[PDB]
Amino acid sequence: GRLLSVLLAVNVLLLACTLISGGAFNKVAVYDTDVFALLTTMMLLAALWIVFYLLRTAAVPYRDAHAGPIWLRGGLVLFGICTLVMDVFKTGYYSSFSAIKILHPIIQAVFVIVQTYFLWISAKDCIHTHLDLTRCGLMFTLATNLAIWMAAVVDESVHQAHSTAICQIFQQGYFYLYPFNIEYSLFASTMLYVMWKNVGRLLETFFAGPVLGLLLFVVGLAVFILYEQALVIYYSFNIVCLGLMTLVSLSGSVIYRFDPTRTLDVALLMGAALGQYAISYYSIVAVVVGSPRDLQGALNLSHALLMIAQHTFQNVFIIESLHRCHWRRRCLKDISLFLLLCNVILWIMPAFGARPHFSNTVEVDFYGYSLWAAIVNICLPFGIFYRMHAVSSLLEVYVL
Amino acid sequence: GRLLSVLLAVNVLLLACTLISGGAFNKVAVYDTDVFALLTTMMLLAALWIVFYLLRTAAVPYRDAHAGPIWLRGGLVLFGICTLVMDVFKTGYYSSFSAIKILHPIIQAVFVIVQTYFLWISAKDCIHTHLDLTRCGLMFTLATNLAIWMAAVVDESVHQAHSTAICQIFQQGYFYLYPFNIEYSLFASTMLYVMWKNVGRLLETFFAGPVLGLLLFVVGLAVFILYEQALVIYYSFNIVCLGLMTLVSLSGSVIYRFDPTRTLDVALLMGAALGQYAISYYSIVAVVVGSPRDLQGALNLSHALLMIAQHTFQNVFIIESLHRCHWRRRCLKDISLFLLLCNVILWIMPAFGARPHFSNTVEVDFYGYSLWAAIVNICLPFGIFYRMHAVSSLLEVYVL
């Protein structure tokens, strides 16, 4: 049943994985035609099951509470809208001409609309019935989102590596919104998995931190808009933000030392941080084996090490605060604010920034454009997910 | 605790993964020096924990029964000995000259000896104490085996793609035993994971089948020794063996239709079959997008489809028999014998055969030598694992 559903998801996802990675990395010709045909079939079958579930459930005597956190649902709709805009540019590019290539955007739009509505209205639904059928359907939808994710990463790693009409605005706009589509796939997959296990079950502040964060929030805005090289202040600000975050988060852990449903929260928090760990690890290798000891190289190495340290210490601080000061209660409510404001800026740059991010120029010549682009496309969405999860967790700590 | 141990394993394995895949696929120079330094550190720390566990346990009031099946332990020792022989060729190649390169074989030999002894004498041990410390140690050892597995696959996919003294016998012999080392890593990882969850818990035949299998067993021997191209009888025999296996396994399912601790057994059986599914999927793509409709192409496509069908139907037959004929009880004991004999030959060819296997010549020009070799090295060990698991399961069915 559950194992069968898992096996099904894995087996069908494995079939998509070889089709996506076999027809794109072969030598004779790029066979992406069957990739779109299978992807269209997956969403159409996934959408058909979803509407069937909606029709037959218009069952769930008890409702979950932590299954649908607002940050998860909000990101799904925000990236779901971006996926719809991406599909508009998808069809807008198709102003020429194969048939399944044109079909793919429309069926994708229908699937994302239906899936977003279904997840919004059934995020915390504890299905007590049709357990056998729904588990396969939920897992099939989970594999569908991961199949789109895998295809999107491969498609991005091919067009970006290899770099008619007004299409330029339609093409580049379409290719700019891919990370948002990948973000939607990651956001849809985690909530589908949350519902899959949720089947057949019944269950005052100081005036120094926020101002420091707000100026960092304001200065962080002034940095990435400036670039919309010969600049080293982007690294300087990021080091200061990460360095301050590392010390501030660590200090909060010291204060606690001086004086349930969380399992998924830690797993998502620690698991999503692996995306930045991997990027930093590749960055560290590229600077100790590649570029010499220069200003840019030293700045990149310090930025990667500070990213690792900040992720680790913020994670341990959030974990400790989740488990749990006459004058330090206001301080504790103040530490969370500085990190929360500093997490939003560290969310904006990777998400809304350009695909060839500034903070990676050595790992470009060290790993090549294609390999480094693939690594970034695989890992950075986990960084965005971690940023949102950390913002939500810091809001929870402030509430507590 | 358990999650922390998992996180630890994942985090340290992720660090090894980027180091192995970053220092080998970069552009300036192949930085495998730090790969051996980290790998040596991992086993040395893993070996130190294992002997520490052995010394302090020379605790476990109750013993598991299905945790250490004989096929799992036997394969570990068989491939553990092969790993020791591989390490002998490893040091035997080092008849020149860096320092850690020479150290790596010796520490690997110590680690494999200690780990094989530890797994043999503690396969079914239900650790009721030191749960926190042992779980991290078991998971760290699990990541150590996977780190060696990942390094072995990358090392194999690099030397094979790029193709002094008598070393030729020392080098080629060393490079021939890599799949056995990878097999040991897969075998060590699964039993380490079996013990990780086993912490803090208290729990007559007919005369037509065997002769058909025995001649197929004998003929199968006569095939692969012949090659130790212009030959198409290897495909002809494999199709006959797989075709007969597909019909025989399916027929056994029909007879049943006419009239607990297994969760890991199905997961290992179905999960390991993914290795052959992936190889077949890549083979199917290479023949419908690449080579035209020729004798070799049609034979390869039929072989891949028959592999998929045989794996699926054998899996469902084994699963159904695990859940569970006045004159058909002898038949049921006879169906298992034909598949069991036919699984041994289908085990011998991928394991003891040459690295450029005969059954893949199109997926060579379609995917390139490097990509196809990497795919085969990733997937085929799962096929060998599945063959052994199927042999053990068919023996169990014959006993039942």
Residue numbers in the entry:
A (entry chain A), B (entry chain B): 28 to 85, 90 to 128, 133 to 198, 231 to 270, 288 to 312, 324 to 354, 364 to 428, 487 to 562
Sentences from the paper on this structure:
In this study, we performed structural and functional characterization of the Caenorhabditis elegans OTOP8 (CeOTOP8) and mouse OTOP2 (mOTOP2) and illuminated a set of conformational changes related to the proton-conducting process in OTOP. Combining the structural information from both channels, we propose a working model describing the multi-step conformational changes during the proton conducting process.
Mouse OTOP2 was expressed in HEK293F cells and purified in glyco-diosgenin (GDN) detergent. The structure from the major group of particles (3.22 Å) is similar to that determined at pH 5.0 (3.06 Å). Among all, the mOTOP2 structures determined at pH 5.0 and 8.0 are better resolved and will be used to represent the low and high pH structures, respectively, in the following discussion. At low pH, TM6 of mOTOP2 forms a bent helix with a kink at Pro246 just one helical turn above Glu250 whose side chain, likely in a protonated state, is pinned to the center of the hydrophobic interface between the N- and C-barrels (left insets). Firstly, the helix-to-loop transition at the N-terminal part of TM6 observed in mOTOP2 determines whether the glutamate is exposed to the extracellular solution for protonation or buried in the inter-barrel interface in a protonated state ready to contribute its proton to an acceptor. Once protonated, the loop-to-helix transition at the N-terminus of TM6 drives the proton-carrying glutamate side chain to the middle of the inter-barrel interface as depicted in state 2. The two conformations observed in mOTOP2 structures represent these first two states of the proton-conducting process, whereas the CeOTOP8 structures likely capture the next two states (states 3 and 4).
